[PDB]
């Protein structure tokens, strides 16, 4: 497939997404690394922006639930260009109703070739790359010649 | 679970995706209801949308191919209180590779209460009911008192 | 894959499904449209038909509950003809363990081209439609052409 | 779950079911078996059965095709107790289509506790087994017992 | 696909799997073949595998809980010729959060073709079969040719 | 669930694996990266091992290929404590036969928290990671005390 480069900029558009079982998880993980954090642009699903700003004081662009549409408003984010990091902790030990709507999403972070982490170690290395808060390079595919072959 | 009431306009926002191997379907059922297509607004995913609008001359909205995020962009509308009706002619007979994304579309319909065609029959049934051109008012969840008793 | 035509009849078979939450919800469509629905022949899962007949007193032709077969025993009937619209009030925010069986009785129902209706919307517009009360062609597969290439 | 019992008969009514890439290894096996296979009852979705009888002169009670509807028809047999025996050579190497059909099939084969085969080793062990020609007692749910406490 | 054989021993190394709602029927089917079973290899995952050696004191290899990788373990096992036949008493009542890990394990004992059943009627008829206590030839497909064809 | 931790060693047991469509761009970062990778212990599935072996001339302990059983044997060693950090490169625009094990194995990756990278750029982030040449402790589940809940 055709592919072209994107540019993540230094300040990242940050999706923070986490099943109710992962919730403390994912609270305690962003109060740690509250001071990084404060540095970027935060999106999350309804319920967990919510408790996140309302902890930590943070001001987070929340959408949708997960189960009415907020996993696929964040994926229609991230297909757009417009997040730069998908940090989603979802329950590997409960079947979730709307699991086609987290494979979905996890589908298109991949496509589209973003940094994403689904577990706290994954997490913690992303966010402690020294280029997590410089600009780079990734490679995406060409949308634009995508269509064109297929029209 | 709360319900609460939203109002489809009388011009309603159609939102027409189909799979490759049933968009010859989609694109003869759309030419021979052209007249009253014509009379409402259209969103489609990527390929679907600009094979309609370059052989109806129509203006059609388009977002994304389906596999790059389409299906979710029209689900977020969905959701968004965005799109009233959903003609999705999916293909039964062939896997597709963002299948995730063709049942969470579904999902989102079905949770939003809109009219959803998956199949010409039903396709035909819809845009033939007296209320299409109408103003309907339709039943769909009360987000907000969902919401309000998660944060509770 | 060549096509042929099939004529709904004017009383329509319709079967009726629905999952434990929806319930309450396809009783209600179906006592507000009982005068309507009086007058055409109705099928049912286990659970769903027996609560229809014993509330409306209409006569249900009553399957197999879904978890059971009741699923594939309305699949089996629409693919020989014998279901002309499928109202299907499935579960969208809870894991059912029969869920292949709710797939791919909406995948037969795509295939054979009937009436489908998932919500109370499109079941309202569905039964609202001129032709539901009359005899109508649909375009359908051609089995037999279908079977002779195969072989 | 209340449980109860039915007798699979000595003559079994035996379903053969083979996805494309399984085909031959099921012909195969029901050729190298077929004078005890001739004594039984032989049902088969259509490719597969019509595959059967033109190469063996076995008569083959044939459904409809697999992706057409034949999965669902020989599960509804299952579950009204007309089929004894499922051999179901699915591909574990090819995506299917109507993947959602052929779970729910082995679903409710497990649920009716019947004989099933999804592979030859398993399909030799079953068919040189005591009972496959004598009549045995299995148990199966109570449905009734299930069903009126449905409606309680 | 290139197939090969390959020699199930006489002594069966038997792998012994039940979702919670089917253990009861798991162990009560132990019980009842104890004299025979005692013959053989046991190996179980987690939680079936302790309940069976502390009900009938038999030894079994117990693997992780199916949930935290047992099922792959046994998988792994079943790939590497390592396991001869699979009881796997899944529940088809019930969604489990591991279903992939279900299907996975399922899968490979297909593609392996060795002797696999899911519900107690299959458990009997491969337990009572003549040469479950022989050694018997089985086809499996060639990876050294396989493979070989992956790196041509 | 309780928790307890375990600790990644400096030298790190990495797992590599890519689907067909995925594996140029594997290698290639594999290639880039080697300085850095012949430092670790490094596995990958049964193809994807040997072609980055062949090319580099780096020793990968290759397991079976994945559909195979290689995702299984690999997921296997993750809950076993033996692989520290996954590299899995699978194809998000082509359906695969084994979707089950690759679902599966990801499943198995988030439960037992070990650094996970499905794409380039997370790939890159994860390596060019401070801590990924020491050893870190990770949080992990306590096994014993969910396996002594289980018997209880």
Known sequence: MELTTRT?????????????????????????????????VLYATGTTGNLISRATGMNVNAMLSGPMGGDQQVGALISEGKI???????????????????????????????????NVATADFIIQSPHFNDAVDILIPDYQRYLADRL
């Not at 109703?97 to 070739?113: E, M």
């Open 8 to 40: 993540l900029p230094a300040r990242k558009h940050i999706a923070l997404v986490a099943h109710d079982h992962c919730k403390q998880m994912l609270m305690s993980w962003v109060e740690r690394h509250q001071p990084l954090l404060e540095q970027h």
């Open 84 to 118: 730069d990091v998908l940090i989603f902790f979802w329950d590997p030990l409960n079947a979730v109703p709307h699991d086609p709507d987290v494979k979905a999403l996890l589908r298109l972070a991949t496509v589209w070739n973003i940094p994403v982490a689904t």
